[PDB]
Design a protein that fits this description.
This protein has 258 residues and is mostly beta strands. The protein has one domain. The chain is 8% helix and 29% strand. It contains four helices and 15 strands. Strands 2, 3, 4, 5, 6, 7, 9, 10, 11, 12, 13, 14 and 15 form a 13-stranded mixed β-sheet that branches. Strands 1-8 form a two-stranded parallel ribbon. The protein starts with 13 loop residues before the first helix and ends with a strand. The chain binds the ligand Cc1cn([C@H]2C[C@H](n3cc(CNc4ccc(S(N)(=O)=O)cc4)nn3)[C@@H](CO)O2)c(=O)[nH]c1=O and zinc ion. Ligand U4V binds next to strand 5, strand 7 and strand 9. Zinc ion (ZN) binds next to strand 7. One of its GO terms (biological process) is angiotensin-activated signaling pathway. This is Carbonic anhydrase 2. Interacts with SLC4A4. Interaction with SLC4A7 regulates SLC4A7 transporter activity. Interacts with SLC26A6 isoform 4 (via C-terminus cytoplasmic domain). It is found in: Cytoplasm; Cell membrane.
């Protein structure tokens, strides 16, 4: 697989290797705020990250992943639209070359500067690889980033990026607290969708928070210094690693808030 975000290997090409790219529950989507309906059946959302154990940060040539120890129920997502317990395995971001683009989800066609994805798998399927084969295998908590005041809880991530500049580089990343990346409100939209990168599996319950976090221009400029390429290859800045909005088809976006 040589998929990426360029003219020759970007989102408009992914369907050739991954025909599910044109499927019935692809992500991301535009969230039409006027059409999304409050759902009183939604239970309270439970983000329980007190025991989260971060291990490492990896540049995988598409984004960087902050990886967690998911060998036990430590950092879990429950409630809201979810049945059962979903374990945090990694988080990553998508971002732009410019502050006016970068998010995958859009809100009334507005693009944010970036989007954070906290990826969790359903513990009833035993491991992540089994979970991605199930329609309810994953829950991704999506958080928008706008440029304004710095996010203090993000700075430890920003400061390690110079040690993982190129594809395949990793660094120790223990004792990182993902609670520092959350906005005040847990108001959210939810809909059934997919991974937003190949293999684009239709296994995700999306939970997208309404309240963005603010990060500084300096923080996002450091994301844009990363490289898609490996060490000793021509430099290709890691920017615009977002898939655009996909057709909603036969789906309803539900709101947690009246
Ligand atoms: C802790 C750990 C991780 N790994 C593997 C599997 C991990 N993985 C695979 C994928 C599938 N791809 C994906 C995910 C989200 C989105 S999005 N943009 O949110 O819709 C798109 C694509 N997601 N995470 C991966 C990262 O940690 O490393 C283990 O094998 N053992 C381990 O112990
Ligand atoms: Zn993502």
């Amino acid at each position: 697989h040589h998929w990426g975000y360029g003219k020759h290997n970007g989102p408009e090409h992914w369907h050739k290797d991954f025909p599910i790219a044109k499927g019935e529950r692809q992500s991301p989507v535009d969230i039409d705020t006027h059409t999304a309906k409050y759902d009183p059946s939604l239970k309270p959302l439970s983000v329980s990250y007190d025991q989260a154990t971060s291990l490492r940060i990896l540049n995988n040539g598409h984004a960087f992943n902050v990886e967690f120890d998911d060998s036990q129920d430590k950092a879990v997502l429950k409630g809201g639209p979810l049945d059962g317990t979903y374990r945090l395995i990694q988080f990553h971001f998508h971002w732009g070359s410019l502050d006016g683009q970068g998010s995958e989800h859009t809100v009334d066609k507005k693009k944010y500067a970036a989007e954070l994805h906290l990826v969790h798998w359903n513990t009833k399927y035993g491991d992540f690889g089994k979970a991605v084969q199930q329609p309810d295998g994953l829950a991704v908590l999506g958080i928008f980033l706008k440029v304004g005041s710095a996010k203090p809880g993000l700075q430890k991530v920003v400061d390690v990026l110079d040690s993982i500049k190129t594809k395949g580089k990793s660094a120790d990343f223990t004792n990182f607290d993902p609670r520092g990346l959350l906005p005040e409100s847990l108001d959210y939209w939810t809909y059934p969708g997919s991974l937003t990168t190949p293999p684009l599996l239709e296994c995700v319950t999306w939970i997208v928070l309404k309240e963005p976090i603010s990060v500084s221009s300096e923080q996002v400029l450091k994301f844009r210094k990363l490289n898609f390429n490996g060490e000793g290859e021509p430099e290709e800045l890691m920017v615009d690693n977002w898939r655009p909005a996909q057709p909603l088809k036969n789906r309803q976006i539900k709101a947690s808030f009246k």
